[PDB]
Amino acid sequence: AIGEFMVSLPRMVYPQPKVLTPCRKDVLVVTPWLAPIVWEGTFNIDILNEQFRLQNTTIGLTVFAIKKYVAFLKLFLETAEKHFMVGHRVHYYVFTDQPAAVPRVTLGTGRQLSVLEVRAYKRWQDVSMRRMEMISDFCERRFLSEVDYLVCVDVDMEFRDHVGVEILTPLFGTLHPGFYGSSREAFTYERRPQSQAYIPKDEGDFYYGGAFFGGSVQEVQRLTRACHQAMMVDQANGIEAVWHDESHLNKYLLRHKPTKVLSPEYLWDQQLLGWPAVLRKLRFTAVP
């Protein structure tokens, strides 16, 4: 459940937070709108796990495996079993054009998987973009009744370390690994005013990655509906945003600030970027 009566935490023995010691001295851990930026060292997972288990939290995870991308599912799901929300209720939603071709991955207790058949678009750009419509079509069909939070990710990825309830919040985006140290002028936002995704050069907080966002079902419905409707306006006007759904996601999260931001620990590419000292954990990574 979300927003229901919260019982009292049990007694717990853990290290005292020290008010006069920063938890990170190398990174920003809170946005200027007071949203936590989630890095290792910012959270005590034992406290968070208690809070979320006492609410009987169910997390849905959406992933699209269309055309040849079904090949990515086995590793994606096996590694999610090892690292994603372990101990909590999880419902995987695998959207595919090949519903008999989903690998038979063994799931832990309290975890289930549904296969949702969808059409395949010809262009990769359309496959990627149309996830927003498809996720929003499914909020009413399933998600409102089945889960508390939705996490929406790319499939060509693997979990390498813990991804848990520290991410859960009404609305989150994730810092794209290519831009976390960049100034806003260098962010690859859509820069043509003719597009609904347009962001001026003097605006922008962060460059969020299209491959990892989420929130409560209500907030994810809002985001995905808004991005789809913006895409359809652009289509009617003969323009396609430079980075497709990621461009629209960035416009949405500029105007509707997320209540948590995930660090690039949660969205990485070791082939392209190595393992900087600032990443204490590499949690969710590109398959090379």
Ligand X SMILES: O=c1ccn([C@@H]2O[C@H](COP(=O)(O)OP(=O)(O)O[C@H]3O[C@H](CO)[C@H](O)[C@H](O)[C@H]3O)[C@@H](O)[C@H]2O)c(=O)[nH]1
Q: Does 260 bind a copy of itself (CB under 8 A)?
A: yes
Separation CA 206–CA 193 (nearest Å): 19
Token pair for residue 135?
């996720």
Which residue's CB is nearer to ligand X, number 29 or number 227?
Answer: 227
With CB under 6 A as the contact rule, which of the stretches 63-71, 80-88, 111-119, 194-202 interacts with ligand X? 63-71
Q: Does 233 bind a copy of itself (CB under 8 A)?
A: no
Separation CA 90–CA 96 (nearest Å): 19
Q: Does 106 bind a copy of itself (CB under 8 A)?
A: no
Token pair for residue 280?
């204490």
Query: DSSP string of 85-135?
Result: STTSEEEEEEEES-TT-S------TTEEEEEEE-PPPSSHHHHHHHHHHHH
Alpha-carbon dihedral sign for residues 38, 206, 227, 255: positive
Token pair for residue 218?
């209500």
Q: Does 180 bind a copy of itself (CB under 8 A)?
A: yes
Rounded to a whole number of angstroms, the minimum distance from the CB of residue 103 to a copy of itself is 35
241 binds, among ligand X, Mn ion, a copy of itself, none (CB under 5 to 8 A by kind): none
What φ, ψ does residue 175 adopt, rounded to 5°? Answer: -65, 125
Rounded to a whole number of angstroms, the minimum distance from the CB of residue 62 to Mn ion is 15
Does 135 carry a binding-site annotation?
no
Does 69 carry a binding-site annotation?
yes
Does 156 carry a binding-site annotation?
yes
Residue 6: is it exposed, middle or buried by C-beta count within 10 angstroms (0-12/13-18/19+)?
exposed
Rounded to a whole number of angstroms, the minimum distance from the CB of residue 201 to a copy of itself is 10
What φ, ψ does residue 188 adopt, rounded to 5°? Answer: -85, 45
Rounded to a whole number of angstroms, the minimum distance from the CB of residue 89 to a copy of itself is 21
The region, left, alpha or beta by phi > 0 then psi within -120 to 50, assigned to residue 272 is: alpha
User: Maximum distance among all alpha carbons in the chain?
Assistant: 60
Among 35, 58, 59, 64, binds ligand X (CB under 6 A): 64
> Is there a catalytic annotation at residue 246?
yes
Binding-residue pattern over the window 177 to 216 for ligand X, x denoting contact by CB under 6 A: --------------------------------xxx-----
Binding-residue pattern over the window 19 to 58 for a copy of itself, x denoting contact by CB under 8 A: xxxxxxxxxxxxxxxx-xxx---xxx--xx--x-------
Q: Does 269 bind Mn ion (CB under 5 A)?
A: no
Asked if 150 and 214 touch (Cβ cutoff 8 Å), the reply is yes
Which residue's CB is nearer to ligand X, number 52 or number 69?
Answer: 69
Among 40, 81, 137, 156, binds ligand X (CB under 6 A): 156
Q: Which are the catalytic amino acids? A: 246
Binding site for ligand X (CB under 6 A): 64-67, 69, 124, 127-128, 154-156, 209-211, 243-246
Q: Which residues are annotated as a binding site?
A: 64-66, 69, 154-156, 176, 188, 246, 269
